[PDB]
């Protein structure tokens, strides 16, 4: 498996538009693109409101925040048995592939993943806040 | 061989557990060397609605 490359030419689902879509943040900060392959034309629900028709084959939609792309991913995966992926697109044209991060969806354990933010103790074994006082900022005993 | 017998009563000693100082029934004890092999089932559910939890060998003591 290798990181896919976004194709901006991909056609988008049939949709008449709405007032729930992108704002000035997309022009200045970042936006998100989700793509998937559809087996047939089918009506699905937009996370921004309304019904859209996915074209047979490649599809492409743009969203304002990451949660919107993953919300549609959950719908497509569970209700239609599809395998979408999405990216983060910066105003200068840079594209950052996001999901699934390593080609395998996170709920399925995969080799080569390195644990992060794992504490080798129980919650009840955290130290008292007095022991981390005056550490340079506000920090919980769970941060050590 | 390790841990209490299946079906026996044990008392929970984990302070942050909902069932601390309460009595449950042993379901099974993993022999594979896991951190928390003792599985205990309780009559009263916790705030999350769960009635079973895993505990270490030294976090359970025979009831009575």
């Amino acid at each position: 498996w290798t990181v896919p490359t976004l194709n901006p030419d991909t056609p988008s689902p049939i949709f008449g538009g709405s007032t729930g879509g992108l704002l000035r943040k997309a022009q200045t900060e970042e936006f998100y693109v989700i793509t998937w392959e559809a087996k047939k034309e089918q009506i699905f629900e937009m996370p921004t409101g309304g019904a859209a028709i996915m074209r047979q084959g490649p599809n492409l939609l743009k969203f304002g925040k990451k949660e919107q792309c993953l919300a549609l991913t959950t719908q497509l995966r569970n209700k239609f048995k599809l395998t979408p992926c999405f990216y983060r697109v910066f105003p200068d044209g840079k594209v950052q592939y996001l999901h699934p991060a390593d080609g395998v969806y996170p709920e399925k354990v995969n080799a080569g993943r390195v644990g992060a933010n794992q504490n080798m103790r129980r919650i009840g074994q955290n130290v008292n806040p007095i022991k981390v006082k005056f550490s340079g900022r506000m920090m919980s005993p769970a941060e050590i | 061989e390790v841990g209490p017998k299946r079906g026996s009563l044990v008392k929970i000693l984990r302070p942050e557990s909902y069932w601390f100082n309460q009595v449950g029934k042993v379901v099974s004890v993993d022999q594979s060397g896991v951190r928390y092999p003792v599985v205990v089932r309780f009559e009263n559910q916790n705030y999350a609605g769960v009635t079973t939890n895993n505990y270490a060998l030294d976090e359970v003591v025979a009831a009575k």
Partner: protein, 733 residues
């Protein structure tokens, strides 16, 4: 990134309107600032304390200046009974001519406000007589304000920053504050009373220009150095003395008359001089207790380690508490607030019943305002004391260093403490409310003889012990054949017994079944408020619902909808809930004080005695009946000087109700709403050319609670203040 706030880099990088709000809210939480060290924390607090001191003295300077400039103090001293003190002048271009005429009162040329703070009676009692006195005092306090402000700057400079060990010298500070700040100050105030205030009350002017050539006593210090201290108690002011003049005046400077001055109906100036002299001696001696650089005195740590009951009933006892208290600024602030908070209530309870200032008792509006003012401040201060006690347990408490001592053992039976507080509150609530409701039903059915009226015999017994002969118990000071009555019969009992058996003042007012019911309402309020504050402190570190609460800090929104839902689970939220009950409790206390004095001041105590045993009586006879003049301050036919209070009355109701919006409706609703406004602005021509720098967001969960409580509290206070002043001054103005 944005500069503001400089103390929090996490906030400075926040791109929303959150940042400005939290920049303000976290400004004085020094411990949470980036890069804070313990030594720098203490130095920052020290400088802030200088800032508070200069502000207080500037505030006192302003009050002196405006009374001298715009008040009628010189006219008031000639006839305090029949002249209303003037606070300051009004200059408002929004006024109409009728308003200009209405507020022109008290002898001033233009519109003015009438003072309710009682500074006139206070300054007159201590010897101030002319506007020149007020002016000079104002200039002096402005200078003292500037010096404190400079001292705060100075001790922030490199060569004037005290070390950490200096701030932790408990023994030395206690010695100086007890003997110097308390004792010498009290001794110096005695000198002022003997040299200035007492001569002024006898018609003699003593000022800076001649105080070195005027003898406070005909025998100057000869009795003091020979031990003949009784020479200063001879020839007190007579019962016919006219305050401020030499008629009927005496020569004593230190007495124990123990009653009220017959004309001013306030405490004798010679008793207040002897009081402070004795207090000064006690505090000067008390300040030589603790060890310093001279090898004598006590070490506080030694005292605490010694007090461990041998039976082990308190475990390790007080072992380790010197470091616990000495190393925790929140433990210290909690103790300071609790002590000052209780002292503020004592000031309220004693100043109304034993008025120290001349002509204070007859100024009914001033008496009501002062009691209500200090009781509400006491209520807020008590909530803070418990708040910082809960902050201590989270941030500062160390279980290992307090192993087995009394503090750690409080956490060991917190369930017993909370559940018993719960039982007391339930019992008081069920039965106090039940008795009121029973009496309302008996009144409603026209059978007032069937209501439950329990005589307060325990309290009446205490009043009899103090000499009140109304109830016929006749023991101790009420029994003329008792040793207590006889022994004091030459010192202070004659004056005290005359004052306590006069039913026209506030010294141990007569009490009955109506007083019984309301006192149990007050106990309900105190216990319930303590329950919420104590539960908040003792569960601050954790509960069965949130075992690791201490890892989340004092204040946080919640822990989410899981585990059944965890709204308002933080110790901060317990304080937020407690403030509502503190306001309700103080509201009951002040309603009680006000109505009982309104009927006394009107010469009809029977109305209170008969209407206070059921709640329709409070609604009809206290609130509804006494609102009539207030709500007519302006109307279709005109307006009068109560229009400002009428306007403020509704102003208070409005702010109160606005607070309900933040308390009832919660964030998620508003955040969705603001998003549609964000969309609309960007799509609107000629308006999308302008744009924000902070992304608008709804207020945070915690912030809504604070702002809503603030509106609730401010409206609560303003509404009552308008009602209190307007209903009293309108009746007696």
């Amino acid at each position: 990134t944005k500069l503001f706030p400089k103390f929090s880099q996490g906030l400075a990088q926040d791109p929303t309107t959150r940042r400005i709000w939290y920049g303000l809210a976290m400004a004085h939480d020094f411990e949470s600032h980036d890069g804070m060290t313990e030594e720098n924390l203490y130095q920052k607090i020290f400088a802030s304390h200088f800032g508070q001191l200069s502000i207080i003295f500037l505030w006192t300077s302003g009050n002196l200046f405006h009374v001298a400039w715009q008040g009628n103090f010189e006219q008031w001293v000639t006839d305090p009974v029949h002249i209303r003190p003037i606070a300051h002048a009004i200059w408002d271009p929004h006024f109409g001519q009728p308003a200009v005429e209405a507020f022109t009162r008290g002898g001033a040329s233009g519109p003015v406000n009438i003072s309710t703070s009682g500074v006139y009676q206070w300054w007159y009692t201590i010897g101030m007589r002319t506007n020149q006195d007020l002016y000079v005092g104002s200039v002096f306090l402005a200078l003292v304000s500037a010096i404190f402000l400079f001292a705060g700057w100075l001790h922030l400079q490199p060569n004037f920053q005290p070390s950490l060990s200096w701030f932790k010298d408990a023994e030395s500070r206690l010695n100086h504050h007890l003997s110097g700040l308390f004792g010498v100050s009290s001794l110096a105030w005695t000198g002022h009373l003997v040299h200035v205030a007492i001569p002024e009350s006898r018609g003699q002017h003593v000022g800076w220009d001649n105080f070195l050539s005027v003898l406070p006593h005909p025998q100057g210090l000869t009795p003091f150095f020979t031990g003949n201290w009784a020479a200063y108690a001879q020839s007190p002011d007579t019962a016919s003395h006219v305050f401020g003049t030499a008629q009927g005046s005496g020569q004593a400077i230190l007495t124990f008359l123990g009653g009220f001055h017959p004309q001013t109906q306030s405490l004798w100036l010679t008793d207040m001089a002897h009081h402070h002299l004795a207090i000064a001696v006690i505090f000067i001696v008390a300040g030589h207790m603790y060890r310093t650089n001279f090898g004598i005195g006590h070490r506080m740590q030694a005292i605490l380690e010694a007090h461990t009951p041998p039976s082990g009933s308190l475990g390790a006892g007080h072992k380790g508490l010197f470091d616990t208290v000495n190393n925790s600024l929140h433990f210290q602030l909690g103790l300071a607030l609790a002590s000052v908070g209780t002292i503020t209530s004592l000031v309220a309870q004693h100043m109304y019943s034993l008025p120290p200032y001349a002509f204070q008792a007859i100024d009914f509006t001033t008496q009501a305002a002062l009691y209500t003012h200090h009781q509400y401040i006491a209520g807020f201060i008590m909530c803070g004391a418990f708040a910082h006690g809960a902050i201590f347990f989270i941030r500062d408490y160390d279980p290992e260093q307090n192993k087995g001592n009394v503090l750690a053992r409080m956490l060991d039976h917190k369930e017993a403490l909370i559940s018993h507080l719960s039982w007391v509150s339930l019992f008081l609530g069920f039965h106090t409310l039940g008795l009121y409701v029973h009496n309302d039903v008996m009144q409603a059915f026209g059978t007032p003889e069937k209501q439950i009226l329990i005589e307060p015999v325990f309290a009446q017994w205490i009043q009899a012990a103090h000499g009140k002969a109304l109830y016929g118990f006749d023991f101790l000071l009420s029994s003329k054949t008792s040793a207590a009555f006889a022994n004091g019969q030459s010192l202070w009992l004659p004056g005290w017994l005359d004052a306590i058996n006069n039913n026209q003042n506030s010294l141990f007012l007569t009490i009955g079944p109506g007083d019984f019911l309301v006192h149990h309402a007050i106990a309900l309020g105190l216990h319930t408020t303590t329950l919420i504050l104590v539960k908040g402190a003792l569960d601050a570190r954790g509960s069965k619902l949130m075992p690791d609460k201490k890892d989340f800090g004092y204040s946080f929104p919640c822990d989410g909808p899981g585990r059944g839902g965890t709204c308002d689970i933080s110790a901060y939220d317990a304080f937020y809930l407690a403030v509502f009950w503190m306001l309700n409790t103080i509201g009951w206390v002040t309603f009680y004080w006000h109505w009982k004095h309104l009927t006394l001041w009107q010469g009809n105590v029977a109305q209170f005695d008969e209407s206070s045993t059921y709640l329709m009586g409070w609604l009809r006879d206290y609130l509804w009946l006494n609102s009539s003049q207030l709500i007519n301050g302006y109307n279709p036919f005109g307006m009068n000087s109560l229009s400002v209070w009428a306007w403020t009355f509704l102003f208070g109701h409005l702010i109160y109700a606005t607070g309900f919006m933040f308390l009832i409706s919660w964030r998620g609703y508003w955040q969705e709403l603001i998003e549609t406004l964000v969309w609309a602005h960007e799509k609107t021509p000629l308006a999308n050319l302008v744009y924000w720098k902070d992304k608008p967001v709804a207020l945070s969960i915690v912030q809504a609670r604070l702002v809503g409580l603030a509106h609730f509290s401010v409206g609560y206070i303003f509404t009552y203040a308008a009602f209190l002043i307007a209903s009293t001054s309108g009746r007696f103005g």
